[PDB]
Amino acid sequence: SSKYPRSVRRCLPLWALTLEAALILLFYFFTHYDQKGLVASYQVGQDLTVMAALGLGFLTSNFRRHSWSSVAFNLFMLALGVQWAILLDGFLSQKVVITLFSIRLATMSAMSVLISAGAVLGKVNLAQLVVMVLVEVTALGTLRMVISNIFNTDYHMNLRHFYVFAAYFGLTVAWCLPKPQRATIPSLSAMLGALFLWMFWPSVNSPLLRSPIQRKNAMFNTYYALAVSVVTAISGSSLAHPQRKISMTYVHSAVLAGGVAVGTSCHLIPSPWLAMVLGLVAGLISIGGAKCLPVCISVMHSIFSLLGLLGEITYIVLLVLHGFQVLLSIGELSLAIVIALTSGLLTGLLLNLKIWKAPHVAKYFDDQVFWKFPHLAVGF
Amino acid sequence: DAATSFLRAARSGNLDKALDHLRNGVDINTCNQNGLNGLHLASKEGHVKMVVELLHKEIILETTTKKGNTALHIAALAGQDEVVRELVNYGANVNAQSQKGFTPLYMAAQENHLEVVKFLLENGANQNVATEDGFTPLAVALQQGHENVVAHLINYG
Amino acid sequence: MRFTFPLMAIVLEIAMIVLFGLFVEYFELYPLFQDVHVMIFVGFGFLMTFLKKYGFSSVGINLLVAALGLQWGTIVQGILQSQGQKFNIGIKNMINADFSAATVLISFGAVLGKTSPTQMLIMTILEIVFFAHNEYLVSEIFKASDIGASMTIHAFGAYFGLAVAGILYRSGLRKGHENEESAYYSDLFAMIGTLFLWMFWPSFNSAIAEPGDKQCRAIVNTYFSLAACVLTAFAFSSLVEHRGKLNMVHIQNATLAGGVAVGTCADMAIHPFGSMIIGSIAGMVSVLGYKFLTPLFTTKLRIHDTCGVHNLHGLPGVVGGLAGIVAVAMGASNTSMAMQAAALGSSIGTAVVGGLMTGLILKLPLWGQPSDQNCYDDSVYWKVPKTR
Amino acid sequence: MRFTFPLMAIVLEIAMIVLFGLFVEYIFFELYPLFQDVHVMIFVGFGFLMTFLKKYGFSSVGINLLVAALGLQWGTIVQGILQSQGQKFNIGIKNMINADFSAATVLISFGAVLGKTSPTQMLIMTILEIVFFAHNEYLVSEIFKASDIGASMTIHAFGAYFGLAVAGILYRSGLRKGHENEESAYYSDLFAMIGTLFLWMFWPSFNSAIAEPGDKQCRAIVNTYFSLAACVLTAFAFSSLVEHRGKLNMVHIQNATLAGGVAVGTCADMAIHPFGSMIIGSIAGMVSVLGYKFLTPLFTTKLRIHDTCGVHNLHGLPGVVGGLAGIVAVAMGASNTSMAMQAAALGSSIGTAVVGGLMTGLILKLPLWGQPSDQNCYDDSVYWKVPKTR
């Protein structure tokens, strides 16, 4: 068919304006507003916002000709996802009361979509990303509600499964897409994004913790695990590379290894040495994943999926120390994986519809598909 | 309405319906609101059987739209290499210029259509014809980072 | 003369030191201050780096202008608040000095690529004087509510810059310029400033908000206004462009118009849905301004605005003032109607008059202004590397 | 050889884990935002400041990340052991801030040898320099009892002169007259401006993180703020003065604008007044620019000390100016503590930095760490996969 992109001058504006108008109407009909630590509480959600817009936004900007779309589409996805997550977390956990804590939780839900979208970025347009944002936020909320109903946990505390849900959802959606690179300056911008993610990830591991000592220990464990993981990743990149050089792309993903590994168990680890051991093991598994997974589409999302599974497994191991609960937690993990896979499949078949005017497979990873450039022939 | 149905059959690839319409008396040179006749839409959607059948029925080959684009321009911009080959085999001017001065080679280079660029260069396309803005296929390929197009343009010379 | 700029910089710094010695004496708002700081120096400076051959001047003159501006604004605002007496310096003084720097940077966006660093020092001094006087008039004489400063910072800075750029009009640049064009990595770098401004704007509108309900309201309203603004700016950028392509100018600037237009009503009880309405209208207005009013201003009114600050700061700032007036109409605030209207009018008028006088001073051929062919070029004032 | 770097790192990490298990156990949230700003300064400011080299951006930012990540752990261990006198200790926010300070010292030293060392060499430098720095700052804070809250002597002067000693030991004859890879590019300079701006913005948190809460912390924040503001003006003015045809130099704008933050460090919490902080910032910027124009060319060619980032002009000379400013402030009566103890802190910082840098550079001079050749200096491709496209 025609490899020249179809005009979205009527699809994209109508779709986005309708979405925003519906969000405004729902906020009018259902949302309602309402001290000493106002700034302290605002700081955590602000850290999550920096990690979503800047960290994940630039982490996927490493593409040679897709940095514009990565950054701007991540911004758009965050803006849509926070509003929709506010409404949906209101609907599935009760009028919707808007606090800074609810905005923080909506930001976490949006970050799930932002992590998933790295597996599909460069192969989709903005409308498909809108569909992905909506369906993925809905699926994560449904998963949390199902867990809260079955295992009698809090709906908000079920958001700890977000690493593995995002990883497997993105893997499934990328698997459903039609089948098909770096530059120095985009790689440096991606290093900026990765550094911001790595620096603020202790805020990802303790937004849902109320007790101050729990948050303290979680941030301590995340900080030390992330330090050990950075060292292990940068050093072992040479082993897991055919030409024995350090890979910037591998580093960008593998710095977050310890943070992901201790994410679900940071508040439970009692001493920094155990967090450092977990960070080292996560770095070694990241090296092995880089060396092995391409043999058996995105390798970084595959190793992130492995790391999230490892984090849940080490949570299972550590929770026993602090056998029915083992079965219950294995069941929670398997339900999370099953729902992530099924919802990713549904999203993938939705994204394959002709109405979205997806880019031709020859036109992947290219900003000219979506953006204005000068001195180009336009139209027919 | 017969012309509209014929143009829709051209756009969709329904060669049998369009041939029936032509037998019924539909003009061969009718065009839509944008100036795209049946050959233009067939070249856009890559329907070589339609392109061949329209050329056999004495369609004008060097007709332009309001933008000044021939069927070769549209086939080059759309990346339909087999339609490009058919059009050139039937005598398409490879060096035709639009209203803004684009050539089929420029359109293929701006859209990273490497094999179209290859065929046009092998068929005598002049990579020195600049646009109104002064841009060459080489310049637009450099701007868009179409490195293989740049490499083949400098290698052919 | 090549020694005019170092002479003026040294003399201005010595004057700043003397004024601090004469007038100045010696923690919950420090994180918000640092957010505003990042907005001032990383946000605007890298936001203006879209020009392919003016990135050095953009970020560096941003740093220089804002560094002079915080000192001079500290002195002027403190003298106004103390009526010529000695005053102490807290976190609020630093925040307000950063706000004065923001106003000067907004005006800088209008004249970017056509002015010298010396002209920028002069404009910084004069503009901060005018801005601080108008802001004192709004805050203490009118006593209007402008906690996010849609009127006193954004509208003022935009129309001050527009007046200066109108006085500094060059006939040779009306049809365009070969250096006035963006590059790919330049727009990638501009996205950094865009994203930092978007991320930290809730602290911009809530830093000096009254603690309690007003500060939380400012944070939440700014956040949801920006959330709606992003979607509407993307939608209208696609709407106004051929085949629905996105324009990086729009995505870089119009995505931030919600923060500007919600500033007056930030701490007001306008509800999150009202904040999203304001943000959507701001994004639409900013995109329409970029698409249609900037060519009209450049070609017909002879007002060239390099960064389109009229579309990000001027029109959304006016929209924010009108939103404040309307919110006063429907009981969202206890401030008077006439005082909000007078604040808007005084901000715009003072900006225009001060910009006229400042631009008339900047038009003297003593500051090393670039030639028409040398506009939007770093090499006039910088040593430029051989490769990109 | 092929496995030296990963093996050394895995052995160092296992040693870190064992030491943490043997010695480390678990006001925090009030000081956490300042620590976050210091963390951004360490990993984004310093890392991107050194990305001005056109073919060394990957190694600059990545080795900055590796060195600082190892440095926080090793500095935690060493500083805690020194404070607790060999006993088990609990870590708080102060421990993280001090560990990031130690990493900052190592990164300052790294700025001198950027482009001429291997990652293995930087692992060894981090390990040795943290020991030397922690012992010196323990001597300054606990035996001398000097006041250096912004660490003009213990971090900046120490790190700069340690790096200068290492660079002098690691001197290359073939690099005396320059190198084709030792030059900047446009977008590399914009990334360097990212690093510069983050350092400049967050320096008040750097200078006030350990300050006593109340008047001292606020004084440190205000003094750093206005000192940096004055420093920018004087750096721009003297960059215009010293260059040909008055053109600004991105090296000066990237580095000399932080000299005010470097120099106000010793006097940060002292009551010097905001105007006094501005005078120190104005001199710091002047001295930094003049150092970059005149001192660095002399040090490289006459003294055989090549310093890649000019860390002597940003951390070395302004650090000594800050220590001297602190001595004048005690004489003025702005501060407690004696004149002799401030002078002893300055002298001990310089001497310990030089001696430790000499021994560290002698260890690094061994042909076992895969250091690059003269032809391959300032090139990422020695250690990284570099994309074909810029």
Ligand SMILES: CC(C)CCC[C@@H](C)[C@H]1CC[C@H]2[C@@H]3CC=C4C[C@@H](O)CC[C@]4(C)[C@H]3CC[C@]12C
């Ligand atoms: C701030 C803006 C929005 C409103 C006020 C701007 C007015 C006062 C400014 C901007 C446009 C300006 C004019 C634009 C063009 C010219 C032609 C020039 O050869 C002489 C000055 C002259 C005639 C300017 C005079 C001042 C002017 C009228």
Ligand SMILES: CC(C)CCC[C@@H](C)[C@H]1CC[C@H]2[C@@H]3CC=C4C[C@@H](O)CC[C@]4(C)[C@H]3CC[C@]12C
């Ligand atoms: C741009 C110019 C025309 C200003 C008009 C902007 C309009 C769309 C804005 C500005 C002021 C806003 C109102 C301010 C206060 C209130 C009361 C509150 O309980 C519900 C929202 C509501 C009703 C807002 C709705 C939207 C609003 C009317």
